[PDB]
Design a protein around this ligand. Structure first.
Ligand SMILES: [Ca+2]
Ligand SMILES: [Ca+2]
Lengths: 342, 321
C-alpha cells in the first residue's frame, strides 16, 4: 500500500469527514477542537462555536458528520461527551451550520442526550451514520456500567435511530412501549467504535470492543439484543452466561484476540478495484489496518495493512477520490492518505 | 480453511519433522521428550537417549530435523537449551541415529555449542534448516544480552552455517578474519524463531523478534549486520512469530507462493503472499480457534502441519477451502 502523511500535530484526533468537491475535510481533536484541512491551505485554526466537552479519559469531542445535503444545507453534526453532575457524564449529539467562510459553527444545538449520565470517563461510543433515507444512527457505549446495556429504560449500550432533527421516528421498534426508550434501535452493546452504511445492502453495520478479547462486528436489527453483558467472547465476565445465549444475537464476525477495533469504512471506489467489496477497520492496540473481504454479508478473508508503521488507527473513511483516509491516535496524531497500487 | 486435530496432549510441543515414505512425524515436547507420531498408531512413548535440556523459560528440547539422507542414514539432528555450570544456558545442536525400531537415539553427539552460555531462560533461537547444497543453518538468539548480537566474537544473535557434520565451511564469510567467529553467517539478530529455505529462490529466509521491537522477516546475506540491513516485512506490534514454511505443494493452488508463519501472542496462522522477494499481502487464518501457533511445516502430502503451544498442545493438519 501507498501512504502519504497529510497532516501531523493533531492532538488525539477522533473523527474525520469529507466536504463536497475540493472543500476539504473536518477533523475532531478529542480535547475539544474542530479543524478544517484542505489540499492547498493546510490546517485551519480551531473553528468557533464547538460545545464544551467532558475531556476526561476517553471523553471529549467525538464524531463530526456533515449532513447528507451539506452541499445545500452546510449542516454539521457532532457527538461529544457532555458533563453531568456528580462528576459523571454521558454522550450527546447536536448540529450547527458551518459558516460559508468555514470559520465558525453557528447555532449549534443538542438534539439528543444519553440518559442517564453514568460515565466517569469510559464507554461513550459516539459514532454516527446516516442510512439511505437520512435517518441518524447513534452508537452509544454502556458508560462502564455493564448491566445497563440490557436495561430497556436506559440509553446505555444502545444503537439509537433518530430523524435528521433528533425526533423519534414513529416506526422505531419500541415506540409506545412502557419502560422502553423509544429512541432505541438495538441494545446489548458494549462500547461501539465503528458504524457504517453498507453501500451494497443498505444495512447499517457496527463493531465494538470486547473486554480483553472478543471484539465483534454486528449487523444490528431493530429491537434485537446483542448480548452484552450476558453474552460475550471476551473474558469470565461476572454477568456472562457464555459465548452464546438464547434470546441474543451472535456477532457477524469476532476476534478472540482483540485488535482494538476503531473506525470502519466500506470501499466502493473504482480507483482500486481490488479493494471493492472490502470493509476496512482500524486497530488501536495492534496498530494496523484490518481489511475484511466480503461476500454479501459474509466475511471470507481477513488481511492486515500498515502494521509496520506503529500507529494506532483511530478513524477510517473512504474518500470520494477513491483513497482511504485515516487518523492516528496519539499526541502527535496524523491524517494519512492510503492507496493500494501506485 | 479445513483443520484436522490429529493429536492432543502434547506438553508444549516445539518442533515437528516428516520422516520419509510416510513413516511418520518426529515431534519435540519442550520439557525434554522426542516422540514419533504415526497416522495409524498415534503417539510413541518418549524416545530414549535424548540429551538433558535446560527446561526453563523458553528453553528445553527445541528443533528436530532429520538429515536429508535419513532414509539411508537415519540421522536425526536436535537443537536444545543446554545447561551450563554457572547457571547460564546456551543453544546446542547435535545428532544421533534413530534406531531401526524407532525406540532410541544412538550415540547422540553435540556438534555445535553457542559460546559463551549467556541465557537465563530466554532467546535461544533454535531453528534449523538445510540449504540446497546441504549446509546446516542454525538460528541463535541473543540470549537476551542485546549488545552481544553485534559482537563479532560472540555466538549470540548469530545465524550460523556449518557443514552437515558441524565443520566450518572454508567458504564462510568470516573465515580467516581475526577475532570473528568463523561459524557466523549473519549477525545482529535478536531472537529468530523462523528459518526456512525458499523453494523457488534457493535462499534461506528468517524471521525473529526484532532488535528495534516488533517482529521482522529477513533474507540474511553473508556477513551482513541486521541491526545495516532492513527487513523484508516488519510488524511493529509483535504477533509473536513462530515457525515458518513455504507452500509449494500442488494440492492447493491458491496457496502456492505463500509463506506461512505462526503467531503465538496473536494466536493465529499468518499467510504472506509472495511475489519474488517481496511481501504483497498478509492474510490471517485460524483466529477462531484461539490457539498459540508455535510450529508450521509444509507436508509432503500438500497439507500444512502445525503445533500449538499449550500444556495441552495439539498437532493440526490444515488445508485450503
Ligand atoms: Ca455481542
Ligand atoms: Ca533487522
Amino acid at each position: 500500500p501507498t501512504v502519504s502523511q497529510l497532516q501531523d500535530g493533531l492532538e488525539h484526533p477522533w473523527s474525520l469527514a469529507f466536504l463536497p468537491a475540493e472543500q476539504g475535510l473536518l477533523i475532531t481533536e478529542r480535547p475539544g477542537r474542530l479543524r478544517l484541512w484542505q489540499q492547498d491551505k493546510g490546517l485551519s485554526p480551531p473553528i468557533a462555536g464547538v460545545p464544551q466537552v467532558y475531556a476526561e479519559g476517553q471523553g471529549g469531542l467525538l464524531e463530526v458528520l456533515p449532513a447528507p445535503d451539506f452541499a445545500a444545507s452546510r449542516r454539521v453534526y457532532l457527538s461529544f461527551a457532555e458533563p453531568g453532575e456528580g462528576g459523571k457524564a454521558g454522550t450527546a449529539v447536536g448540529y450547527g451550520r458551518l459558516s460559508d467562510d468555514d470559520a465558525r459553527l453557528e447555532n449549534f444545538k443538542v438534539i439528543f442526550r444519553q440518559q442517564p449520565k453514568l460515565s466517569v470517563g469510559n464507554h461513550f461510543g459516539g459514532k454516527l451514520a446516516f442510512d439511505r433515507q437520512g435517518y441518524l444512527f447513534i452508537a452509544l457505549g454502556e458508560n462502564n456500567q455493564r448491566p445497563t446495556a440490557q436495561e430497556t429504560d436506559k440509553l446505555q449500550g444502545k444503537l439509537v435511530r433518530l430523524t435528521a432533527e433528533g425526533a423519534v421516528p414513529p416506526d422505531n421498534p419500541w415506540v409506545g412501549q412502557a419502560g422502553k426508550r423509544p429512541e432505541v434501535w438495538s441494545y446489548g452493546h458494549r462500547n461501539p467504535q465503528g458504524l457504517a452504511l453498507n453501500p451494497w445492502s443498505g444495512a447499517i453495520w457496527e463493531h465494538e470492543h470486547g473486554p480483553r478479547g472478543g471484539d465483534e462486528l454486528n449487523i444490528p436489527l431493530p429491537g434485537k439484543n446483542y448480548g452484552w453483558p450476558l453474552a460475550t467472547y471476551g473474558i469470565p465476565i461476572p454477568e456472562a452466561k457464555g459465548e452464546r445465549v438464547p434470546g441474543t444475537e451472535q456477532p457477524l464476525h469476532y476476534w478472540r484476540v482483540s485488535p482494538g477495533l476503531s473506525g470502519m469504512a466500506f470501499y466502493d471506489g473504482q480507483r482500486f478495484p481490488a479493494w471493492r467489496h472490502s470493509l476496512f477497520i482500524g486497530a488501536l492496540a495492534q496498530k494496523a489496518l484490518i481489511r475484511l473481504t466480503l461476500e454479501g454479508d459474509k466475511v471470507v478473508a481477513e488481511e492486515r495493512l500498515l502494521g509496520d508503521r506503529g500507529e494506532r488507527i483511530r478513524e477510517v473513511r473512504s474518500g470520494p477520490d477513491g483513497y482511504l483516509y485515516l487518523l492516528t491516535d496519539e499526541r502527535d496524531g496524523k491524517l494519512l492518505k492510503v492507496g493500494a497500487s501506485l
